[PDB]
Amino acid sequence: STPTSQSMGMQIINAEQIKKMPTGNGSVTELLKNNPNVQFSNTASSSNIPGELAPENVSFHGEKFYNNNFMVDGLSNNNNINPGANNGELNQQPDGYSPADLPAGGPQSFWINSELIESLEVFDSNISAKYGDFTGGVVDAKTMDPKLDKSSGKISYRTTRDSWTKYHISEVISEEFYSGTNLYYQPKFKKHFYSATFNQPLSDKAGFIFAYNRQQSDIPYYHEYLQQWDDQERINETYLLKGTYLTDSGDIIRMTGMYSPHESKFYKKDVKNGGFTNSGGGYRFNMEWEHNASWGKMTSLAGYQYTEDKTEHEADSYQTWRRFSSGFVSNVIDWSSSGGANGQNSNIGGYGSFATNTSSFSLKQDYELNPVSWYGINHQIDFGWETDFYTSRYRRFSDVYTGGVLVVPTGASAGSVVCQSGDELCIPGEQYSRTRILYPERNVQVSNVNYAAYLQNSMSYGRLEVTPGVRVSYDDFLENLNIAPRFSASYDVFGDRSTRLFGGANRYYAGNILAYKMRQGIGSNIQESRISPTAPWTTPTLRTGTNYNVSDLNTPYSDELSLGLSQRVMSTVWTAKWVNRQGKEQFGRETTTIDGQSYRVMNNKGHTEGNTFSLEVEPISPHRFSFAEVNWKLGASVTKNKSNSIYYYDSANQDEQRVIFDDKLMYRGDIDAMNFNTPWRAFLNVNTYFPAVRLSWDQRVGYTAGYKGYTTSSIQVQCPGGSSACNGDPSFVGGATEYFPTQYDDFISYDWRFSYSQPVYKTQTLDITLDVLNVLDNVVETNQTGTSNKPIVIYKPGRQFWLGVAYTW
Ligand SMILES: CCCCCCCCO[C@@H]1O[C@H](CO)[C@@H](O)[C@H](O)[C@H]1O
Ligand SMILES: CCCCCCCCO[C@@H]1O[C@H](CO)[C@@H](O)[C@H](O)[C@H]1O
Ligand SMILES: CCCCCCCCO[C@@H]1O[C@H](CO)[C@@H](O)[C@H](O)[C@H]1O
Ligand SMILES: CCCCCCCCCCCC[N+](C)(C)[O-]
Ligand SMILES: CCCCCCCCCCCC[N+](C)(C)[O-]
């Protein structure tokens, strides 16, 4: 059995516990909301953005949001190229809009639905040497296994809508919002979730399981100027197939296969054929071999996993044409993109396709030895190793041409454009392009190999438990070998199990980013010119634009200290604990100069702190108090998190800037963190079951410290005189931007889930499921944008209904 000091710092959510928490989009990170050690992006749940299907972003003890280890079925599900794009916030032009974009796709490469999952193991504190490639938390999601006894199976269906959603939108925006001209202002929409599961035995000793799961979301979108309604789309799919076979020997062989594409359908604004789609996800193949020997257990795995973020546009060339201007009106340009009174231009097309992928083959092996007493104490030993050979690419699939400067001869020479038979950049009689920019077919490619091994020894003298462990890893990307001591202890103060202390000190090293590699060539373009529209294209010249590059880096780590205490007061367990995290050597941005050419490059100048006091109360067993039965759980936390100005790996170092902030003139690097920094929150869950009418009545209540919004001075406060804070440093001379707080008040969150089951033909049932999400519909500020000039507040979703129908057998 696992050591008591490590369980103290992990969560376990089995499938029946999952079904009893009320949910929107079922997604992995959503399930973390009952964990007092985690926080979410200020924008992660917002009323502007239903219809969106991605996973929320999460940060453990205020560590980076892209420094978590997300696993599925114990294997990595992390994007190690570009996971923290735009520090996790959305972009009015999602990445791929523009020709020279590095695709994003976020911290998880497979977006797995909250069905499909048997158990979720969530480690945040005193983590095991067995787990690496994180600074923050570990989030292992175990999919459904086959059963060998019966032929289970289920078909579900589930939906929500704009009708059914009550919105909260600022005014200021409400005009623009309801026009539906903004991608991420979605007033009208429909989500649809299908699922199908087949459990299937073959022998007394072998069976498989097929599962499928589709989430889809349609969002209308309008072009002013172009004057068209197009439909945005969001599709997530998961196909899953697992066999298991028990040998004559008593050893076990498993085999998994997964395919988890997701895509997002977008539109370049007011552009004829402006469409483009952003595919993500990929697939897996496992093969796993348990062996049960006299000494212990030995599980040996081989795996392969292709994952890919690709942007693909409706067309592979882009033009900007003129509809009309002084002296000119086209017979051929129907549409417009601008609406100027005296001049209108018309954009058409797009920037080809292009992508990043990672192909990777993995070989794990883990040993669980049987306990062994030696020199008077028990030795639970684990050890193991693993190695991963991977290859990352970026590719533009084919040459994409953009139109350059325009000509529109008018007046004396008004009709005189004479085109070439094939010429995509010439409209006979009207207009042509003098220059033309070619973004070329390209390819950049890394192939690497990481190695890791770990040894742990949980020893116990009775009363005591003390588990020193080591994880050693080497990435040949940075070529660093890192050694991570993990230490975790526990003491029982009087037999009993009534009163136990525990603590520990550990170090977690992160995995790779490697975006700066993939961007190396990126944004190369070759521009040509021509005198007339029958001249040949003449003077090709290669520009690179912003150049990116590799540098000599340390691997970012996080150091931990923990101390806690678990009391059993009555028939109710009160466990309270402290954790502190120094996050160190965190990647950021530098501009460096090589040969007169300049280069964006990664540094190790970021840093973070995390400090959390967490309490947790939970009764021993449910109350049967009588005609129904009720269980309950209660979490709470107090949380101070810190940060540089280096928010993520593409943030430049603006620490030495001077900034006014709360009343006194100070350096920017020392100001409060403004994402993942809610000072406290408490939450209670109550699951109620009325067996008399087969009705489940699940409620989540929560009281939460309010948001604190900031805005900034549009104009820098110049400083010898010009603010009475300039005296905080009389010598200082220069500018400084002032931050203006608005402290919103603490708020009550309240969520419901009903689930009624109903027999149909003996062994079958039909299940009705209803979620009421913001029950009181009360308004809460989540996030604040803009200068003081124009401040914009964003709110948490109002009351929302989800309706589900399941059919089991
Ligand atoms: C279980 C074995 C996997 C079977 C899935 C085969 C279908 C994969 O389809 C492919 O997947 C990649 C990422 O999704 C894309 O980049 C490819 O262009 C696409 O054709
Ligand atoms: C768990 C600890 C294992 C240590 C292995 C260190 C390997 C360092 O050795 C390097 O590894 C590269 C990638 O594998 C090779 O291609 C290089 O030739 C070699 O310099
Ligand atoms: C068994 C008792 C568990 C509680 C451990 C006390 C942890 C105190 O630890 C301290 O907490 C401060 C917060 O006020 C932080 O400012 C400091 O960084 C930290 O050293
Ligand atoms: C038994 C379940 C198998 C899943 C069937 C999925 C069928 C659709 C495959 C994708 C094709 C696109 N579209 C829009 C028709 O769905
Ligand atoms: C892991 C076993 C699952 C195998 C399923 C293979 C998917 C077949 C492709 C059908 C079309 C899928 N897509 C992307 C169009 O939706």
Author numbering: 59 to 867
Manuscript excerpt for this entry:
In our current work we have identified the outer membrane receptor responsible for ferredoxin and pectocin import in Pectobacterium spp., which we designate FusA. To understand the mechanism of ferredoxin import we have solved the crystal structure of FusA and two of its plant ferredoxin substrates, and using nuclear magnetic resonance (NMR)-driven molecular docking we have modelled the FusA–ferredoxin complex.
Recombinant FusA (derived from P. atrosepticum SCRI1043) was expressed in E. coli and purified and refolded from inclusion bodies to yield stable, monodisperse FusA, which was used to undertake crystallization trials. Phases were obtained and the structure solved using platinum single-wavelength anomalous dispersion data at 4.2 Å from a K2PtCl4 soaked crystal, with the final atomic model refined against native data to 3.2 Å resolution. However, the similarity of FusA to other TBDRs is limited to this transmembrane region, while the extracellular loops, which constitute ∼46% of the polypeptide chain, are highly divergent from any previously described protein structure. Large extensions are present at the end of loops 4 and 5, which double back over the outside of the barrel. On the opposite side of FusA, loops 8–11 are also highly elongated and form extensive interactions with each other, although they lack the regular β-sheet structure of loops 4, 5 and 7. As with other protein-binding TBDRs and in contrast to those which bind small molecules, the extracellular loop of the plug domain is highly extended, with residues 144 to 162 exposed to the external environment.
